[PDB]
Design an enzyme around this catalytic site. Sequence first.
Site, PDB file in Angstrom:
ATOM      1  N   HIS A  41       5.223   7.206 -34.631  1.00  0.00           N
ATOM      2  CA  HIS A  41       6.275   7.919 -35.369  1.00  0.00           C
ATOM      3  C   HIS A  41       5.983   8.000 -36.866  1.00  0.00           C
ATOM      4  O   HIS A  41       6.693   8.729 -37.553  1.00  0.00           O
ATOM      5  CB  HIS A  41       7.689   7.349 -35.075  1.00  0.00           C
ATOM      6  N   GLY A 143      10.752  -0.339 -43.078  1.00  0.00           N
ATOM      7  CA  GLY A 143       9.381  -0.555 -43.485  1.00  0.00           C
ATOM      8  C   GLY A 143       8.646  -1.568 -42.646  1.00  0.00           C
ATOM      9  O   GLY A 143       7.440  -1.734 -42.810  1.00  0.00           O
ATOM     10  N   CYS A 145       8.117  -1.494 -39.376  1.00  0.00           N
ATOM     11  CA  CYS A 145       7.441  -0.991 -38.195  1.00  0.00           C
ATOM     12  C   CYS A 145       5.932  -1.188 -38.294  1.00  0.00           C
ATOM     13  O   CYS A 145       5.347  -1.110 -39.376  1.00  0.00           O
ATOM     14  CB  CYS A 145       7.729   0.499 -37.987  1.00  0.00           C
TER      15      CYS A 145
HETATM   16  C1  FJC Z   1      10.185   1.156 -39.106  1.00  0.00           C
HETATM   17  O1  FJC Z   1       9.790   0.674 -40.107  1.00  0.00           O
HETATM   18  C2  FJC Z   1      11.672   1.172 -38.859  1.00  0.00           C
HETATM   19  C3  FJC Z   1      12.175  -0.265 -38.597  1.00  0.00           C
HETATM   20  C4  FJC Z   1      13.831  -0.325 -38.387  1.00  0.00           C
HETATM   21  C5  FJC Z   1      14.365  -0.066 -39.430  1.00  0.00           C
HETATM   22  C6  FJC Z   1      15.778  -1.024 -39.513  1.00  0.00           C
HETATM   23  N1  FJC Z   1      15.555  -2.093 -38.868  1.00  0.00           N
HETATM   24  C7  FJC Z   1      14.281  -1.831 -38.039  1.00  0.00           C
HETATM   25  O2  FJC Z   1      13.753  -2.570 -37.307  1.00  0.00           O
HETATM   26  N2  FJC Z   1      12.018   1.959 -37.699  1.00  0.00           N
HETATM   27  C8  FJC Z   1      12.757   3.200 -37.776  1.00  0.00           C
HETATM   28  O3  FJC Z   1      13.131   3.627 -38.811  1.00  0.00           O
HETATM   29  C9  FJC Z   1      13.041   3.918 -36.470  1.00  0.00           C
HETATM   30  C10 FJC Z   1      12.274   5.219 -36.324  1.00  0.00           C
HETATM   31  C11 FJC Z   1      12.647   5.739 -34.933  1.00  0.00           C
HETATM   32  C12 FJC Z   1      12.020   5.205 -33.817  1.00  0.00           C
HETATM   33  C13 FJC Z   1      12.358   5.651 -32.551  1.00  0.00           C
HETATM   34  C14 FJC Z   1      13.328   6.615 -32.404  1.00  0.00           C
HETATM   35  C15 FJC Z   1      13.963   7.142 -33.517  1.00  0.00           C
HETATM   36  F1  FJC Z   1      14.917   8.100 -33.362  1.00  0.00           F
HETATM   37  C16 FJC Z   1      13.625   6.696 -34.784  1.00  0.00           C
HETATM   38  N3  FJC Z   1      14.474   4.236 -36.309  1.00  0.00           N
HETATM   39  C17 FJC Z   1      15.430   3.162 -35.892  1.00  0.00           C
HETATM   40  O4  FJC Z   1      15.041   2.070 -35.704  1.00  0.00           O
HETATM   41  C18 FJC Z   1      16.958   3.543 -35.693  1.00  0.00           C
HETATM   42  C19 FJC Z   1      17.531   4.801 -35.935  1.00  0.00           C
HETATM   43  C20 FJC Z   1      18.915   4.706 -35.606  1.00  0.00           C
HETATM   44  C21 FJC Z   1      20.000   5.632 -35.648  1.00  0.00           C
HETATM   45  C22 FJC Z   1      21.268   5.222 -35.254  1.00  0.00           C
HETATM   46  C23 FJC Z   1      21.480   3.907 -34.816  1.00  0.00           C
HETATM   47  C24 FJC Z   1      20.416   3.000 -34.773  1.00  0.00           C
HETATM   48  C25 FJC Z   1      19.122   3.420 -35.178  1.00  0.00           C
HETATM   49  N4  FJC Z   1      17.911   2.737 -35.237  1.00  0.00           N
END
Ligand code: FJC
Lengths: 304, 304
Positions: A41, A143, A145
């Site tokens: 991603h 950040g 990931c």
């Molecule tokens: C990567 O660095 C980051 C780590 C996240 C951020 C907050 N705590 C973590 O462990 N990951 C993301 O930003 C991901 C990206 C993603 C991955 C798969 C599918 C997606 F649609 C987006 N996004 C999330 O983790 C995420 C997005 C949302 C929206 C609403 C509710 C929860 C949620 N989690």
Amino acid sequence: SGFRKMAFPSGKVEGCMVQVTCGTTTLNGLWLDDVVYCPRHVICTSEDMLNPNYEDLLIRKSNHNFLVQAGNVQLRVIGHSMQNCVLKLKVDTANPKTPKYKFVRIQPGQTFSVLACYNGSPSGVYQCAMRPNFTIKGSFLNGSCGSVGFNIDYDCVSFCYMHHMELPTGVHAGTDLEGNFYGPFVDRQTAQAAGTDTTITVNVLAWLYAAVINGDRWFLNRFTTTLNDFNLVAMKYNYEPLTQDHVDILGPLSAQTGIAVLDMCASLKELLQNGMNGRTILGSALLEDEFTPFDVVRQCSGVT
Amino acid sequence: SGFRKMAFPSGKVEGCMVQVTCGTTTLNGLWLDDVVYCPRHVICTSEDMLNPNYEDLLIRKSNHNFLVQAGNVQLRVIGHSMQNCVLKLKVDTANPKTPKYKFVRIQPGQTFSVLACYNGSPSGVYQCAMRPNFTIKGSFLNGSCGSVGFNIDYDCVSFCYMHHMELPTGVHAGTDLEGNFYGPFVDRQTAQAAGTDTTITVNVLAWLYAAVINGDRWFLNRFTTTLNDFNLVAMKYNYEPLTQDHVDILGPLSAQTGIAVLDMCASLKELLQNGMNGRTILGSALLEDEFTPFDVVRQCSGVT
Ligand SMILES: *C(=O)[C@H](C[C@@H]1CCNC1=O)NC(=O)[C@H](Cc1cccc(F)c1)NC(=O)c1cc2ccccc2[nH]1
Ligand SMILES: *C(=O)[C@H](C[C@@H]1CCNC1=O)NC(=O)[C@H](Cc1cccc(F)c1)NC(=O)c1cc2ccccc2[nH]1
């Protein structure tokens, strides 16, 4: 003596963490030999996520769109490809700090260490279990990931987890290092949610044995139970059924303490039915299930 | 999101661990520049311990009695001296992996990471607090002495603890890296025992703020308390008095959550007087006191 949630020493993994940037997204990558592994991603924009076709998105990228930084050295990307949900960036330099390693997928109920990283820089290390519902209860921010989970055996790092996302309940989901998700989660925007979870019975029994080895005995009793009667109680309290293989795996701890596995199960049944009555076990007022029998043996060697 | 007992990445310290052997005793040493630091009780026999004069014992040793091994390389000892309860072995090679470092003594209530080692080989990493009674609740076996505790700031390792002994209650005692014990403990055989301990109030309040940041709110209330009335309750439950400096240190977390420190104190008072009524906070059924306000801020950045 003593019993702590202990992680593996993280240095062998620290030497593999790099920063990967594509566009305005920065996250972490894992640099082993001449390949950097990271979540695919990284190539997405925000609107890409509610319906991404990654094959299309990747066919529009070239090597120069990926900025890889190892400490303060830029690594030249000379190829790119996608394996399931991970991106493999071939670079022109083999990591001189590559450990002996393996890519292993773990089972629910097994534990591993997480090296949380930001901007390719390690921030903290902690121990986690893979839950029965294939989530992990981690500690991860924006950040993080591409941070990885791993175990170490002798000199060999078995990588088992790469971090991709946080679910709505605040728990975490990711892949093995082949890019295959743990559990029914996807790297696209959905209403996906953690499924119902259960307590890891064999690990609770292991931790009760740790407690006995460390001198907490108040929950022991003279009774025994049968495996069937125990598992009726387990079912009622949302604990995973105990198998004869679990009993077999607990054999060493049972021998060390002299407490038969089904005797310890009778203690667990009493704890589930009665609570602790204001007492603690190994400093906890809950029954702890994120220590495997191997974790207990490794940590409690020779206290007897 | 999420909140874990997180240690610092241990690689910078792993690169400093060596094995020190004198006679039939093997333990760990810390190799920084051309000096290896280790517990002076390495030079003792078992009967030496109930009444050792270390000046005499050391005057009977020479360099060749100390075998120092860094991985599979023997380090030549070219001088020896004793600083309080630590032995300084000068070796003929500076450690090429020496990090930027400092020797800092910590206060009770502060946390640090422990790299448990055996035979100069790192085994596990975990986070510990220095208790008010100057013990630590560690996880240490035979052979772990000379393992160190540390914090890392930017690139700099502040070493604050070297492990020497286990007390009768299963908790642990050691020195700073100048060889000065934490608390009223000695490296000789006595009936010494941990003194009465207390709960680290400012850390419990920090952890309640962590819980709020992570969405646990059930213990909040509309009430406030005065600092004096709170500290009357603290005294009754064996909690350390809360100072205005503690209130000041909690300022950032209070601002992030919008919950005044004395409002959170009113919640803590209710929890002490009532218990949790079967609920949990951040996965615990006890009030946790081994996270400092800095630990919470570092880990919970930007969840808001
Ligand atoms: C990567 O660095 C980051 C780590 C996240 C951020 C907050 N705590 C973590 O462990 N990951 C993301 O930003 C991901 C990206 C993603 C991955 C798969 C599918 C997606 F649609 C987006 N996004 C999330 O983790 C995420 C997005 C949302 C929206 C609403 C509710 C929860 C949620 N989690
Ligand atoms: C060093 O490797 C070792 C670590 C111990 C071993 C068990 N768990 C640990 O953390 N330390 C020792 O063996 C020390 C040596 C020592 C230090 C100071 C004074 C001494 F008299 C001995 N011994 C102990 O930790 C120790 C000895 C006894 C006797 C009775 C009760 C408790 C106890 N602890």
